[PDB]
Amino acid sequence: SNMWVIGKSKAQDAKAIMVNGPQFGWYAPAYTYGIGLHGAGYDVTGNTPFAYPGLVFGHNGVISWGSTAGFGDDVDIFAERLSAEKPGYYLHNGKWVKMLSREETITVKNGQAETFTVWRTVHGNILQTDQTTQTAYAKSRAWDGKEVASLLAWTHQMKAKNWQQWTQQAAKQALTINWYYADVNGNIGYVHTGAYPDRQSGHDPRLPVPGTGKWDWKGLLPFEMNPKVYNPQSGYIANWNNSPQKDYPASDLFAFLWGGADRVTEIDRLLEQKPRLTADQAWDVIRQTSRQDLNLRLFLPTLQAATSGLTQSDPRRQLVETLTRWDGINLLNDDGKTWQQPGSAILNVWLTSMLKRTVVAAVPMPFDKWYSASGYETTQDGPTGSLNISVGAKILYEAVQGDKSPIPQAVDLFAGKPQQEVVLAALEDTWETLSKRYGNNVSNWKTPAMALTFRANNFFGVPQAAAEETRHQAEYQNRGTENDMIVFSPTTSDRPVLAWDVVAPGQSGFIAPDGTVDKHYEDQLKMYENFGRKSLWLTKQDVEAHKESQEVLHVQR
Amino acid sequence: SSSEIKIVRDEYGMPHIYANDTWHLFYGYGYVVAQDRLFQMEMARRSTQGTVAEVLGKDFVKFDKDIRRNYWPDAIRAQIAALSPEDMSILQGYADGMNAWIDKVNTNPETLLPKQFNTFGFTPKRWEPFDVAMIFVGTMANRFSDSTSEIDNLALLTALKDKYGVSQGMAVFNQLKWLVNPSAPTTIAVQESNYPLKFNQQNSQT
Ligand SMILES: O=C(O)Cc1cc(O)ccc1O
Ligand SMILES: [Ca+2]
């Protein structure tokens, strides 16, 4: 998910602009729900996933807010000491404590019912147990007990009118989530929200701790520790799930890393390119970053150095010159199915071969398979979420930086060979694979584009629509599931705010029993594909002026 | 009027709710949600509670068990019972507004029941506050704020220790899954602040 927020000093024709593309995958009906709420202290407009009570994306006429996933480490695993005799008990601070337990019955349409038990200790639910060691693992979340308060903090923040009131609510959201602020006077801010454990000295958060008592968290860290900035010296805030701040540790997932190779650099380059941006230019960063190959910038220098002494008729060199002429922006041909330049296919095959000769080789089976993906893996329906740089590729980037990388190379991933020799062998593997399928004339290579599917199944794999309700879009775009833009004190209007969004396929998912589809079932789908957007209304007079219908209810509690 | 809820939809079908108190405002919101997204909301409700196999069958039994093992419903109901009356209104108003449209739907199904309920063979049920809260918990806390691979990390570490020896196995683990990397691009510039904590990276807990 990405976000860029542009303040007073960088904004042109406005004091503040906020653009947000939360990335959750692409579904039918739409992941988010548009809603305006006027009364009881609330005066808001925006859209929010699964119609939660609190609006994750929108504004209240004075401030505006948005989010991206935080990925802090807020979950640790506790290795509980069981007993072969006295089962259902575990050792904790010198006594044998009994477990919480509940019984569940799964009813099954057209089958027999199944019943199982769930177990819980003071550290949390039991994930798995090793009867051989007599250990049971319990997953302990820092936000446990604060789920409902986090939902409410996301609802109350919609009433804030300044930074001080808004941060009061950010201090109560306990999930690992980045939160962003903008306001009518041109102030901008960011808070990496959530509850993080106050761990004992010597606790390495990437690995399990004994659940017997001595490794127990001391409590939670105060809100003053949460990474936060207000009116940054740069003039802007940008994030694409990258690190909040210097020295902040990331989630303990083995596949997740914050390293020198990071896709947020692609946004930074565009915001640093121009001294001031307009709203139209801030919106247009969605289009560029959507279409940008993420590996090009990282490994083009390495490819150039390795083929620099090669002759012009060496095909490894011709592959690197095609890459050298490219800006990395993918564009569809007129057929609607192949890309205009073969660069992403070349990087894909190169990187797969490079990882197999380097990272994969140093890791024992079957963990080697965690580091072999190039990051271009998809199917015919296309990626299920954003495109990112793969783990194996971030680890390989540190290795090709040499002693310029701060990460100690405990094993030489090039295994004694000079780098250039390994790059040239992978480049030969690439030429061999691609020329075989496409031929030797690089200029007529028409390589397959990634497409985009709005799925009928929700993110869990469960149907939320019939299979025919699936929608297909020819061009894959690395962008938010929805995009929304808020512009404060526009010099081009009399309104203090202007806001837009796009929620595709449409506002409604309704299909009558006779098969008649609601009028607003797919009227935003083509707008999504062409980078268009619709206006969000806030004031009564704008709502009245654009009203299509009205329904009044009279109800008493 | 305190009993009045006015719903205005714009040219894109987007609802705006006008009401004078909390309970009426969120009742309006729930009511338009049930109008626009009832089947999606009902399959999200079964997904976040693990009751998919009752309408969809035997392929979803493992799914349903996994959902149920990852949470403790009594701890959620206890948090709902500690809310103040104003906060509780948000959740109760929302579930009541949904219930109002679901009642009309189950009374006039020939024109108002979403086609997919006929297709998959079942009908909507009424919601309570617990169900509203579980939409947010299952799709925001539970999926997206619950990531860990600590047990798989330890099996990686153990296999690196066998291959390269005890100290060396640790140092390679730090090359592959570092704790921090000082050259990562950060949303906050270093001139504004840096994180103040330092962490153990030796697995000192064994
Ligand atoms: O980006 C993600 O993968 C998940 C996510 C996105 C977002 O915009 C807000 C919260 C969140 O968890
Ligand atoms: Ca952890």
PDB file of C-alpha atoms in Angstrom, chain A residues 29-40 42 45 48 50-53 74-77 102 104-109 114 116 120 125 137 139 141 143 145 147-148 151-152 156 175-176 190 202-209 215 221 225 228-229 232-233 237-239 242-249 251-254 256-260 262 362-364 367 370-371 395 398 406-411 413 458-460 462-464 469 506-507 509-513 520 523 527 536-537 540 543 546-557, chain B residues 2-19 21-27 29 31-33 35-37 39-41 43-44 47 53-58 60-61 63-65 68-73 76 79 83 87 89-90 94 109-116 135-157 159-160 164 168 170-188 190-195 197-205:
ATOM      1  CA  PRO A  29     -17.799  -6.490  -5.157  1.00  0.00           C
ATOM      2  CA  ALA A  30     -15.320  -3.875  -4.022  1.00  0.00           C
ATOM      3  CA  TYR A  31     -13.165  -4.193  -1.049  1.00  0.00           C
ATOM      4  CA  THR A  32     -14.113  -0.758   0.281  1.00  0.00           C
ATOM      5  CA  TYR A  33     -17.437   1.036   0.796  1.00  0.00           C
ATOM      6  CA  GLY A  34     -18.236   4.732   0.191  1.00  0.00           C
ATOM      7  CA  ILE A  35     -20.168   6.557   2.991  1.00  0.00           C
ATOM      8  CA  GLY A  36     -20.761  10.138   4.283  1.00  0.00           C
ATOM      9  CA  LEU A  37     -21.871  10.658   7.919  1.00  0.00           C
ATOM     10  CA  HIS A  38     -23.397  13.953   9.044  1.00  0.00           C
ATOM     11  CA  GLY A  39     -24.563  14.308  12.685  1.00  0.00           C
ATOM     12  CA  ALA A  40     -23.802  13.554  16.344  1.00  0.00           C
ATOM     13  CA  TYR A  42     -19.499  13.747  12.816  1.00  0.00           C
ATOM     14  CA  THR A  45     -16.809  11.758   3.654  1.00  0.00           C
ATOM     15  CA  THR A  48     -13.479   2.153   4.166  1.00  0.00           C
ATOM     16  CA  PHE A  50     -15.880  -3.888   4.763  1.00  0.00           C
ATOM     17  CA  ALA A  51     -17.930  -0.764   5.720  1.00  0.00           C
ATOM     18  CA  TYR A  52     -16.305  -0.591   9.204  1.00  0.00           C
ATOM     19  CA  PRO A  53     -17.918   2.011  11.516  1.00  0.00           C
ATOM     20  CA  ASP A  74       4.185  -7.081  17.629  1.00  0.00           C
ATOM     21  CA  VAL A  75       3.816 -10.829  17.883  1.00  0.00           C
ATOM     22  CA  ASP A  76       6.203 -13.253  19.720  1.00  0.00           C
ATOM     23  CA  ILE A  77       5.945 -17.029  20.313  1.00  0.00           C
ATOM     24  CA  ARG A 102     -13.204 -24.417  24.930  1.00  0.00           C
ATOM     25  CA  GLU A 104     -16.038 -26.207  19.215  1.00  0.00           C
ATOM     26  CA  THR A 105     -18.426 -28.017  16.869  1.00  0.00           C
ATOM     27  CA  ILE A 106     -18.119 -27.352  13.168  1.00  0.00           C
ATOM     28  CA  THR A 107     -21.496 -28.025  11.481  1.00  0.00           C
ATOM     29  CA  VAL A 108     -21.026 -29.086   7.828  1.00  0.00           C
ATOM     30  CA  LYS A 109     -23.663 -28.770   5.056  1.00  0.00           C
ATOM     31  CA  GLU A 114     -16.718 -32.086  13.756  1.00  0.00           C
ATOM     32  CA  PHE A 116     -12.225 -30.098  18.485  1.00  0.00           C
ATOM     33  CA  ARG A 120      -4.934 -20.988  25.657  1.00  0.00           C
ATOM     34  CA  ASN A 125      -3.781 -19.490  22.011  1.00  0.00           C
ATOM     35  CA  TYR A 137       3.791 -22.924  21.291  1.00  0.00           C
ATOM     36  CA  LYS A 139       1.184 -16.980  19.993  1.00  0.00           C
ATOM     37  CA  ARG A 141       0.075 -10.517  20.438  1.00  0.00           C
ATOM     38  CA  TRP A 143      -2.665  -5.906  20.932  1.00  0.00           C
ATOM     39  CA  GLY A 145      -7.404  -7.318  24.642  1.00  0.00           C
ATOM     40  CA  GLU A 147      -9.192  -5.120  19.356  1.00  0.00           C
ATOM     41  CA  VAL A 148     -12.432  -3.227  20.147  1.00  0.00           C
ATOM     42  CA  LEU A 151     -11.894  -0.013  16.011  1.00  0.00           C
ATOM     43  CA  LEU A 152     -13.182   2.826  18.213  1.00  0.00           C
ATOM     44  CA  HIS A 156     -13.287   8.805  17.050  1.00  0.00           C
ATOM     45  CA  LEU A 175      -2.543  -2.682  15.552  1.00  0.00           C
ATOM     46  CA  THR A 176       0.750  -2.203  13.612  1.00  0.00           C
ATOM     47  CA  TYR A 190       2.732  10.588  10.255  1.00  0.00           C
ATOM     48  CA  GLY A 202      18.630 -10.570  25.619  1.00  0.00           C
ATOM     49  CA  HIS A 203      15.331 -11.451  23.955  1.00  0.00           C
ATOM     50  CA  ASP A 204      15.947 -11.829  20.184  1.00  0.00           C
ATOM     51  CA  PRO A 205      12.495 -11.074  18.762  1.00  0.00           C
ATOM     52  CA  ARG A 206      12.949 -13.280  15.636  1.00  0.00           C
ATOM     53  CA  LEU A 207      12.914 -16.548  17.516  1.00  0.00           C
ATOM     54  CA  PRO A 208      10.859 -18.287  20.211  1.00  0.00           C
ATOM     55  CA  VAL A 209      11.218 -17.697  23.938  1.00  0.00           C
ATOM     56  CA  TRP A 215      11.197 -14.224  29.342  1.00  0.00           C
ATOM     57  CA  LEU A 221       6.294   0.548  25.340  1.00  0.00           C
ATOM     58  CA  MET A 225       8.495   5.566  21.487  1.00  0.00           C
ATOM     59  CA  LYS A 228       6.289   9.881  14.415  1.00  0.00           C
ATOM     60  CA  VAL A 229       6.987  13.165  12.522  1.00  0.00           C
ATOM     61  CA  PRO A 232       9.064  17.241   8.221  1.00  0.00           C
ATOM     62  CA  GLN A 233      11.979  19.444   6.907  1.00  0.00           C
ATOM     63  CA  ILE A 237       5.872  12.030   3.702  1.00  0.00           C
ATOM     64  CA  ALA A 238       6.116   8.892   1.495  1.00  0.00           C
ATOM     65  CA  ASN A 239       5.692   5.226   2.339  1.00  0.00           C
ATOM     66  CA  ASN A 242       9.090   0.560   3.994  1.00  0.00           C
ATOM     67  CA  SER A 243      10.688   1.327   7.303  1.00  0.00           C
ATOM     68  CA  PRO A 244       9.281   4.130   9.424  1.00  0.00           C
ATOM     69  CA  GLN A 245      12.629   5.280  10.783  1.00  0.00           C
ATOM     70  CA  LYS A 246      16.340   4.535  11.225  1.00  0.00           C
ATOM     71  CA  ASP A 247      16.968   1.470  13.467  1.00  0.00           C
ATOM     72  CA  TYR A 248      13.311   0.372  13.706  1.00  0.00           C
ATOM     73  CA  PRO A 249      13.074  -3.420  13.511  1.00  0.00           C
ATOM     74  CA  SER A 251       8.174  -7.962  11.521  1.00  0.00           C
ATOM     75  CA  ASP A 252       9.941 -11.291  12.215  1.00  0.00           C
ATOM     76  CA  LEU A 253       8.615 -12.894   8.986  1.00  0.00           C
ATOM     77  CA  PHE A 254      11.516 -14.632   7.191  1.00  0.00           C
ATOM     78  CA  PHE A 256      10.021  -9.679   4.942  1.00  0.00           C
ATOM     79  CA  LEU A 257      12.962  -7.248   5.090  1.00  0.00           C
ATOM     80  CA  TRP A 258      13.728  -3.542   5.126  1.00  0.00           C
ATOM     81  CA  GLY A 259      17.055  -3.199   3.279  1.00  0.00           C
ATOM     82  CA  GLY A 260      18.942  -0.920   0.885  1.00  0.00           C
ATOM     83  CA  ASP A 262      13.200  -0.821  -1.298  1.00  0.00           C
ATOM     84  CA  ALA A 362      24.170 -21.293   0.506  1.00  0.00           C
ATOM     85  CA  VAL A 363      20.884 -22.411   2.160  1.00  0.00           C
ATOM     86  CA  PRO A 364      20.193 -26.023   3.168  1.00  0.00           C
ATOM     87  CA  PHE A 367      14.739 -23.707   3.159  1.00  0.00           C
ATOM     88  CA  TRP A 370      12.225 -19.576   0.441  1.00  0.00           C
ATOM     89  CA  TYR A 371      14.832 -17.536  -1.461  1.00  0.00           C
ATOM     90  CA  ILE A 395      19.694 -10.253   0.010  1.00  0.00           C
ATOM     91  CA  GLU A 398      23.465  -6.359  -0.349  1.00  0.00           C
ATOM     92  CA  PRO A 406      26.359  -2.553   6.282  1.00  0.00           C
ATOM     93  CA  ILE A 407      25.439  -6.285   6.445  1.00  0.00           C
ATOM     94  CA  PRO A 408      28.387  -8.556   7.255  1.00  0.00           C
ATOM     95  CA  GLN A 409      28.739 -11.196   4.541  1.00  0.00           C
ATOM     96  CA  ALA A 410      29.276 -14.214   6.772  1.00  0.00           C
ATOM     97  CA  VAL A 411      29.224 -16.497   3.730  1.00  0.00           C
ATOM     98  CA  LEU A 413      27.388 -15.769  -1.792  1.00  0.00           C
ATOM     99  CA  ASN A 458     -12.662 -12.806  -0.821  1.00  0.00           C
ATOM    100  CA  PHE A 459      -9.067 -12.759   0.467  1.00  0.00           C
ATOM    101  CA  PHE A 460      -9.696 -15.844   2.614  1.00  0.00           C
ATOM    102  CA  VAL A 462     -14.333 -17.813   0.323  1.00  0.00           C
ATOM    103  CA  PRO A 463     -16.915 -16.829  -2.253  1.00  0.00           C
ATOM    104  CA  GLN A 464     -18.477 -13.408  -1.764  1.00  0.00           C
ATOM    105  CA  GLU A 469     -19.084 -11.888 -11.283  1.00  0.00           C
ATOM    106  CA  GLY A 506     -18.980   0.241  -8.016  1.00  0.00           C
ATOM    107  CA  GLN A 507     -20.806   1.281  -4.832  1.00  0.00           C
ATOM    108  CA  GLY A 509     -23.055  -5.299  -5.165  1.00  0.00           C
ATOM    109  CA  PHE A 510     -26.815  -5.755  -5.496  1.00  0.00           C
ATOM    110  CA  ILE A 511     -28.341  -8.211  -7.964  1.00  0.00           C
ATOM    111  CA  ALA A 512     -32.148  -8.776  -7.719  1.00  0.00           C
ATOM    112  CA  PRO A 513     -33.568 -12.264  -7.714  1.00  0.00           C
ATOM    113  CA  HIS A 520     -24.283   1.300  -9.446  1.00  0.00           C
ATOM    114  CA  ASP A 523     -20.162   2.283 -13.166  1.00  0.00           C
ATOM    115  CA  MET A 527     -12.816   4.918 -14.572  1.00  0.00           C
ATOM    116  CA  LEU A 536     -16.338  13.169  -2.968  1.00  0.00           C
ATOM    117  CA  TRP A 537     -18.942  15.576  -1.511  1.00  0.00           C
ATOM    118  CA  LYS A 540     -24.968  19.828   2.435  1.00  0.00           C
ATOM    119  CA  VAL A 543     -24.803  16.749  -1.525  1.00  0.00           C
ATOM    120  CA  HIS A 546     -25.733  16.036  -6.732  1.00  0.00           C
ATOM    121  CA  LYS A 547     -28.536  14.075  -5.163  1.00  0.00           C
ATOM    122  CA  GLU A 548     -29.966  11.204  -7.220  1.00  0.00           C
ATOM    123  CA  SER A 549     -32.409   9.976  -4.516  1.00  0.00           C
ATOM    124  CA  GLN A 550     -33.639  10.366  -0.944  1.00  0.00           C
ATOM    125  CA  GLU A 551     -35.135   8.010   1.679  1.00  0.00           C
ATOM    126  CA  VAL A 552     -36.290   9.168   5.138  1.00  0.00           C
ATOM    127  CA  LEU A 553     -36.857   6.779   8.074  1.00  0.00           C
ATOM    128  CA  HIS A 554     -38.573   7.477  11.416  1.00  0.00           C
ATOM    129  CA  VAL A 555     -37.334   5.138  14.173  1.00  0.00           C
ATOM    130  CA  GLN A 556     -37.290   5.078  17.937  1.00  0.00           C
ATOM    131  CA  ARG A 557     -34.799   3.117  19.974  1.00  0.00           C
TER     132      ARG A 557
ATOM    133  CA  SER B   2     -34.645  12.948  17.048  1.00  0.00           C
ATOM    134  CA  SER B   3     -36.317   9.932  15.426  1.00  0.00           C
ATOM    135  CA  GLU B   4     -35.568  10.972  11.869  1.00  0.00           C
ATOM    136  CA  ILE B   5     -32.827   9.511   9.669  1.00  0.00           C
ATOM    137  CA  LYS B   6     -32.418  11.044   6.202  1.00  0.00           C
ATOM    138  CA  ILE B   7     -30.435   9.101   3.551  1.00  0.00           C
ATOM    139  CA  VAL B   8     -29.325  10.987   0.398  1.00  0.00           C
ATOM    140  CA  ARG B   9     -27.508   9.009  -2.360  1.00  0.00           C
ATOM    141  CA  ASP B  10     -25.340  10.870  -4.916  1.00  0.00           C
ATOM    142  CA  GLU B  11     -24.844  10.298  -8.639  1.00  0.00           C
ATOM    143  CA  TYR B  12     -22.550   7.343  -7.879  1.00  0.00           C
ATOM    144  CA  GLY B  13     -24.975   5.786  -5.417  1.00  0.00           C
ATOM    145  CA  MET B  14     -22.861   6.879  -2.433  1.00  0.00           C
ATOM    146  CA  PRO B  15     -25.026   7.307   0.687  1.00  0.00           C
ATOM    147  CA  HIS B  16     -24.866  10.334   3.022  1.00  0.00           C
ATOM    148  CA  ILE B  17     -26.490   9.848   6.494  1.00  0.00           C
ATOM    149  CA  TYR B  18     -28.121  12.744   8.365  1.00  0.00           C
ATOM    150  CA  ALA B  19     -29.227  11.948  11.927  1.00  0.00           C
ATOM    151  CA  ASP B  21     -27.708  11.100  17.710  1.00  0.00           C
ATOM    152  CA  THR B  22     -25.187   8.281  17.620  1.00  0.00           C
ATOM    153  CA  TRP B  23     -27.600   5.399  17.572  1.00  0.00           C
ATOM    154  CA  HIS B  24     -29.605   6.943  14.707  1.00  0.00           C
ATOM    155  CA  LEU B  25     -26.480   7.824  12.648  1.00  0.00           C
ATOM    156  CA  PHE B  26     -24.975   4.317  12.776  1.00  0.00           C
ATOM    157  CA  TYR B  27     -28.378   2.765  12.261  1.00  0.00           C
ATOM    158  CA  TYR B  29     -25.074   3.420   8.020  1.00  0.00           C
ATOM    159  CA  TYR B  31     -29.157   0.074   6.787  1.00  0.00           C
ATOM    160  CA  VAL B  32     -27.492   1.312   3.559  1.00  0.00           C
ATOM    161  CA  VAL B  33     -24.753  -1.356   3.979  1.00  0.00           C
ATOM    162  CA  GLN B  35     -28.942  -2.427   1.010  1.00  0.00           C
ATOM    163  CA  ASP B  36     -25.711  -2.356  -1.019  1.00  0.00           C
ATOM    164  CA  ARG B  37     -23.567  -5.250   0.224  1.00  0.00           C
ATOM    165  CA  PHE B  39     -24.192 -11.098   0.507  1.00  0.00           C
ATOM    166  CA  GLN B  40     -20.583  -9.818   0.739  1.00  0.00           C
ATOM    167  CA  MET B  41     -21.167  -8.879   4.403  1.00  0.00           C
ATOM    168  CA  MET B  43     -19.860 -14.238   3.717  1.00  0.00           C
ATOM    169  CA  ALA B  44     -17.400 -11.916   5.493  1.00  0.00           C
ATOM    170  CA  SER B  47     -15.263 -16.060   7.157  1.00  0.00           C
ATOM    171  CA  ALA B  53     -18.803 -25.102   6.134  1.00  0.00           C
ATOM    172  CA  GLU B  54     -22.437 -24.904   7.344  1.00  0.00           C
ATOM    173  CA  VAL B  55     -23.493 -23.343   4.010  1.00  0.00           C
ATOM    174  CA  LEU B  56     -20.602 -24.462   1.744  1.00  0.00           C
ATOM    175  CA  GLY B  57     -19.701 -27.919   2.974  1.00  0.00           C
ATOM    176  CA  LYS B  58     -16.757 -30.224   3.530  1.00  0.00           C
ATOM    177  CA  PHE B  60     -14.266 -25.585   4.230  1.00  0.00           C
ATOM    178  CA  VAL B  61     -13.887 -27.643   7.442  1.00  0.00           C
ATOM    179  CA  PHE B  63     -10.582 -23.358   7.049  1.00  0.00           C
ATOM    180  CA  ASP B  64     -13.283 -23.117   9.748  1.00  0.00           C
ATOM    181  CA  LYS B  65     -11.156 -24.889  12.295  1.00  0.00           C
ATOM    182  CA  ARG B  68     -11.595 -20.718  15.351  1.00  0.00           C
ATOM    183  CA  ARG B  69      -8.216 -21.736  16.717  1.00  0.00           C
ATOM    184  CA  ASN B  70      -6.808 -18.264  16.077  1.00  0.00           C
ATOM    185  CA  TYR B  71      -9.054 -16.250  18.468  1.00  0.00           C
ATOM    186  CA  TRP B  72     -10.912 -16.366  21.797  1.00  0.00           C
ATOM    187  CA  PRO B  73     -14.499 -15.117  21.397  1.00  0.00           C
ATOM    188  CA  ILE B  76     -14.012 -10.109  22.539  1.00  0.00           C
ATOM    189  CA  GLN B  79     -14.442  -5.970  25.707  1.00  0.00           C
ATOM    190  CA  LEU B  83     -18.028  -0.143  26.636  1.00  0.00           C
ATOM    191  CA  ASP B  87     -19.549   3.749  22.361  1.00  0.00           C
ATOM    192  CA  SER B  89     -24.438   2.762  20.556  1.00  0.00           C
ATOM    193  CA  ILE B  90     -22.141   2.825  17.515  1.00  0.00           C
ATOM    194  CA  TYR B  94     -25.109  -0.447  13.179  1.00  0.00           C
ATOM    195  CA  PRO B 109     -37.793 -12.144  -0.810  1.00  0.00           C
ATOM    196  CA  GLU B 110     -39.281 -12.272  -4.296  1.00  0.00           C
ATOM    197  CA  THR B 111     -37.942  -8.770  -5.017  1.00  0.00           C
ATOM    198  CA  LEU B 112     -35.432  -7.943  -2.300  1.00  0.00           C
ATOM    199  CA  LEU B 113     -33.282 -11.030  -1.611  1.00  0.00           C
ATOM    200  CA  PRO B 114     -29.859 -10.754  -3.344  1.00  0.00           C
ATOM    201  CA  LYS B 115     -29.585 -13.369  -6.100  1.00  0.00           C
ATOM    202  CA  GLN B 116     -26.518 -15.170  -4.606  1.00  0.00           C
ATOM    203  CA  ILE B 135     -15.699  -7.987  10.786  1.00  0.00           C
ATOM    204  CA  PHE B 136     -12.926  -5.609  11.900  1.00  0.00           C
ATOM    205  CA  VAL B 137     -11.035  -8.183  14.047  1.00  0.00           C
ATOM    206  CA  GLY B 138     -10.945 -10.916  11.438  1.00  0.00           C
ATOM    207  CA  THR B 139     -10.040  -8.701   8.462  1.00  0.00           C
ATOM    208  CA  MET B 140      -7.703  -6.147  10.089  1.00  0.00           C
ATOM    209  CA  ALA B 141      -6.304  -7.489  13.379  1.00  0.00           C
ATOM    210  CA  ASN B 142      -6.363 -11.196  12.550  1.00  0.00           C
ATOM    211  CA  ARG B 143      -5.261 -11.096   9.084  1.00  0.00           C
ATOM    212  CA  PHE B 144      -3.104  -8.014   8.749  1.00  0.00           C
ATOM    213  CA  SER B 145      -1.528  -7.394  12.261  1.00  0.00           C
ATOM    214  CA  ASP B 146      -0.874 -10.997  13.146  1.00  0.00           C
ATOM    215  CA  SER B 147       2.291 -11.946  11.163  1.00  0.00           C
ATOM    216  CA  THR B 148       4.990 -14.143  12.714  1.00  0.00           C
ATOM    217  CA  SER B 149       7.238 -17.025  11.445  1.00  0.00           C
ATOM    218  CA  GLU B 150       9.237 -17.495  14.658  1.00  0.00           C
ATOM    219  CA  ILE B 151       8.893 -21.268  14.655  1.00  0.00           C
ATOM    220  CA  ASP B 152      10.006 -21.537  10.997  1.00  0.00           C
ATOM    221  CA  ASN B 153      12.865 -19.127  11.720  1.00  0.00           C
ATOM    222  CA  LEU B 154      14.108 -21.526  14.423  1.00  0.00           C
ATOM    223  CA  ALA B 155      14.035 -24.522  12.092  1.00  0.00           C
ATOM    224  CA  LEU B 156      16.035 -22.390   9.546  1.00  0.00           C
ATOM    225  CA  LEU B 157      18.562 -21.467  12.280  1.00  0.00           C
ATOM    226  CA  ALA B 159      19.674 -26.226   9.856  1.00  0.00           C
ATOM    227  CA  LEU B 160      22.230 -23.396   9.370  1.00  0.00           C
ATOM    228  CA  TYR B 164      28.161 -24.236   9.174  1.00  0.00           C
ATOM    229  CA  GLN B 168      28.779 -19.539  11.845  1.00  0.00           C
ATOM    230  CA  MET B 170      24.162 -17.691  13.619  1.00  0.00           C
ATOM    231  CA  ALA B 171      26.141 -15.236  11.527  1.00  0.00           C
ATOM    232  CA  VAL B 172      24.565 -16.575   8.295  1.00  0.00           C
ATOM    233  CA  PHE B 173      21.108 -16.314   9.906  1.00  0.00           C
ATOM    234  CA  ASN B 174      21.963 -12.636  10.519  1.00  0.00           C
ATOM    235  CA  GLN B 175      22.933 -12.239   6.838  1.00  0.00           C
ATOM    236  CA  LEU B 176      19.658 -13.710   5.629  1.00  0.00           C
ATOM    237  CA  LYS B 177      17.188 -12.273   8.188  1.00  0.00           C
ATOM    238  CA  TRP B 178      18.955  -9.317   9.739  1.00  0.00           C
ATOM    239  CA  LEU B 179      17.271  -7.563  12.685  1.00  0.00           C
ATOM    240  CA  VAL B 180      17.984  -4.062  11.310  1.00  0.00           C
ATOM    241  CA  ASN B 181      19.735  -2.644   8.223  1.00  0.00           C
ATOM    242  CA  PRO B 182      20.945   0.945   8.589  1.00  0.00           C
ATOM    243  CA  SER B 183      20.783   1.629   4.869  1.00  0.00           C
ATOM    244  CA  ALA B 184      16.988   1.017   4.477  1.00  0.00           C
ATOM    245  CA  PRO B 185      15.101   4.046   3.088  1.00  0.00           C
ATOM    246  CA  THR B 186      12.884   5.426   5.874  1.00  0.00           C
ATOM    247  CA  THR B 187       9.674   7.496   5.864  1.00  0.00           C
ATOM    248  CA  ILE B 188      11.202   9.721   8.584  1.00  0.00           C
ATOM    249  CA  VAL B 190      17.489  10.719  10.122  1.00  0.00           C
ATOM    250  CA  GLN B 191      17.714  14.449  10.792  1.00  0.00           C
ATOM    251  CA  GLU B 192      14.280  14.225  12.570  1.00  0.00           C
ATOM    252  CA  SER B 193      14.762  11.200  14.848  1.00  0.00           C
ATOM    253  CA  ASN B 194      15.926   7.565  15.069  1.00  0.00           C
ATOM    254  CA  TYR B 195      14.439   4.687  17.056  1.00  0.00           C
ATOM    255  CA  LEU B 197      15.912   0.793  21.337  1.00  0.00           C
ATOM    256  CA  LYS B 198      18.616  -1.792  20.606  1.00  0.00           C
ATOM    257  CA  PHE B 199      17.855  -5.505  20.501  1.00  0.00           C
ATOM    258  CA  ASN B 200      19.642  -8.789  21.079  1.00  0.00           C
ATOM    259  CA  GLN B 201      20.569 -10.534  17.804  1.00  0.00           C
ATOM    260  CA  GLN B 202      22.205 -13.695  19.120  1.00  0.00           C
ATOM    261  CA  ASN B 203      19.158 -15.620  20.237  1.00  0.00           C
ATOM    262  CA  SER B 204      20.450 -15.081  23.821  1.00  0.00           C
ATOM    263  CA  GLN B 205      17.253 -16.702  25.219  1.00  0.00           C
TER     264      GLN B 205
END
